[PDB]
């Protein structure tokens, strides 16, 4: 069920997030406190001691002073809080104080799901955004060569039959994606595509 910290840590490095990548964190990722450098990370929604539940991606652009929060489902902070017991306020607090002069910062995020409700490709997508972020961090969410391959759909439409032919089609091209760029992906591809399948959560 899903991708493990090592899996993600290895793939994120195949996708070149290397120079910019701050590791994998439980729900208590500090923020971007270090210096004003293009940084990014992977933060689990849950605390390490649950075993770990959902993967999130987080990015910092210098120019724009913008935290990108990326949930492959585009759940709102309010929904993420409700489903996953997750909030990242004091996260942005530390960050915007650590890094911004006026102590202000922009929070940019999806309203739009790329994942199927049942899928467990949650890190693999997070990894895909972390490739788009580390090459076009000014426009990471859409209109770059990495997300132009993917098709966002209104979050609120998630539990709907109309969407899934597109939500499967993101998940094929997400595999095409990683296969193309990650040596570790190809190496583990079969067990990865099996453990993160479209319908894993009813293949449990």
């Amino acid at each position: 069920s899903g991708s493990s910290e090592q899996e993600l840590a290895a793939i994120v490095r195949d996708l070149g997030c290397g120079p910019y990548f701050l590791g994998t964190h439980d729900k208590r990722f500090p923020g971007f406190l270090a210096g004003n450098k293009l940084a990014c990370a992977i933060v689990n929604t849950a605390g390490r001691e649950t075993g770990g539940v959902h993967w999130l991606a987080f990015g910092w652009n210098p120019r724009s002073r913008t935290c990108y929060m990326f949930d492959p489902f585009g759940f709102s902070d309010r929904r993420l809080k409700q489903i996953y017991s997750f909030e990242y306020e004091a996260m942005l607090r530390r960050s915007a104080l650590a890094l911004s002069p006026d102590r202000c910062l922009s929070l940019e995020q999806s309203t739009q799901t790329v994942q199927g409700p049942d899928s467990a490709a949650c890190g693999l997508f997070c990894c895909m955004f972390l490739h788009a972020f580390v090459h076009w961090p000014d426009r990471p969410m859409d209109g770059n060569p990495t997300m132009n391959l993917l098709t966002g759909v209104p979050n609120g439409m998630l539990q709907s039959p109309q969407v899934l032919p597109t939500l499967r089609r993101n998940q094929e091209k997400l595999y095409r994606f990683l296969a193309h760029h990650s040596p570790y992906f190809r190496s583990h591809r079969a067990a990865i595509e099996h453990a993160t399948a479209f319908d894993k959560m009813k293949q449990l």
Partner: peptide, 11 residues
């Protein structure tokens, strides 16, 4: 890719 919403926060 995905639509998004940018929210200017301050602290």
């Amino acid at each position: 890719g995905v639509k998004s919403l940018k929210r200017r926060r301050c602290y």
